Design a protein around this ligand. Structure first.
Ligand SMILES: [Mg+2]
Ligand SMILES: [Mg+2]
Ligand code: NA
Ligand code: NA
Lengths: 224, 223
């Protein structure tokens, strides 16, 4: 039985370090689990102004916000109220690499709210690279590949940051999703994503995000 | 001018998380910079007993402890008293991966002591893997390849953990060393390492380490 509702709140707190630079970011937002859309307003409370591209942090700021068709098992909505946690490695093509974790649960009060405890760490970003030079524009849309492995769910996605000077900067995502209770496991499937920074101040101490995500089973066998 | 001396103290504090499990470890030790040897006694003060193999943490607990030949530029000893920091990615063959950083400096009270601030994070370690099942025996010796890249020093090394059931579990290290001041840069070279846990209690809440390291220029051209 699912306890998810159409309108739910989001509370997040991220603590981390990139190339040794420590920072803390908090935020509040809301989302529509069944429509696969969400928003969050972020505020850098420690470590600002960040010396690296804020874009590397955005996907860390919940697959429960995905419109899942009836035919596909929803690993995430089943996991609540207890919730689930995820672990992720984000390997950039120039050697830079980030690891992040998020422990998600719903508040015990009927406030329909998700609480997110996030840790984010990145290292080996070249001083003259697009991340430390803040030359990123946005993440392109993507299609995450979902598959079960040893009783848990994995999601791998080829990501790409559009650069200011044109061209792309690739990053390979490897995520492991772990429900806090036994839930039905889904067959191999996909999750399309579109996420962007809808607003931000000069130094990105204030950032607004938006994401739209939908699950599917890939292209039909027959054309048209 | 180097301010390094033959006998120096070591103080370390590591804060981290592996597969979401938080922990804090502190330690005290000593080393001989010129002989390339060092020891450290570690104590898990938070998060114990650790659910993962302690071996994944040991290389995080200073390349200043390497016997460098006269003919090879020593990037590390030159950096003090200011010091240097390092960043490292440790990619295991089964997908597990760890990142760590260490900010190293010398105390300014004349106590000949290195202070180390370490952050360690690991994710994607399979529940049935040797790390989460604590089936590791030790790290084999190694030879780290040192090369300059964009004004800083990189060190890459093929590492391997001997497993209890026999066989090895490989990990590729990619480290970036950054001096806090301008120092002479070295030519491509190598650093041989031998590190081991010389003592530990049942759950590894108490662990003693030892490392021996020496730099060199590789095999001579002639046999
Ligand atoms: Mg922008
Ligand atoms: Mg042992
Ligand atoms: Na399914
Ligand atoms: Na040299």
């Amino acid at each position: 039985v699912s306890v998810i509702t159409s309108e739910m709140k989001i509370e997040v707190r991220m603590e981390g370090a990139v190339n040794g630079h420590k920072f803390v970011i908090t935020g509040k937002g809301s989302g529509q689990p069944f429509e696969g859309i969400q928003n969050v307003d972020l505020t850098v409370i420690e470590g600002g102004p960040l010396p690296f591209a804020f874009d590397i942090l955005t996907t860390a700021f919940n697959r429960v916000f995905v419109k899942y068709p009836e035919e596909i098992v929803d690993y995430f909505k089943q996991s609540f109220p207890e919730g689930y946690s995820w672990e992720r490695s984000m390997s950039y093509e120039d050697g830079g690499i980030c690891l992040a974790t998020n422990n998600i649960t719903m508040k015990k009060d009927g406030s329909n709210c998700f609480v997110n405890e996030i840790r984010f760490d990145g290292v080996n970003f070249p001083a003259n690279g697009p991340v430390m030079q803040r030359k990123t524009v946005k993440w392109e849309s993507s299609t995450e590949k979902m598959y079960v492995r040893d009783g848990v769910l994995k999601g791998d996605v080829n990501m790409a940051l559009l650069l200011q000077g044109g061209g792309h900067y690739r990053c390979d995502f490897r995520t492991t999703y772990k429900a806090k209770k036994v839930v039905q496991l889904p067959d191999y499937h996909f999750v399309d994503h579109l996420m962007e920074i809808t607003s931000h101040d000069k130094d990105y101490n204030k950032v607004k995000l938006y994401e739209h995500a939908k699950a599917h089973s890939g292209l039909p066998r027959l054309a048209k």
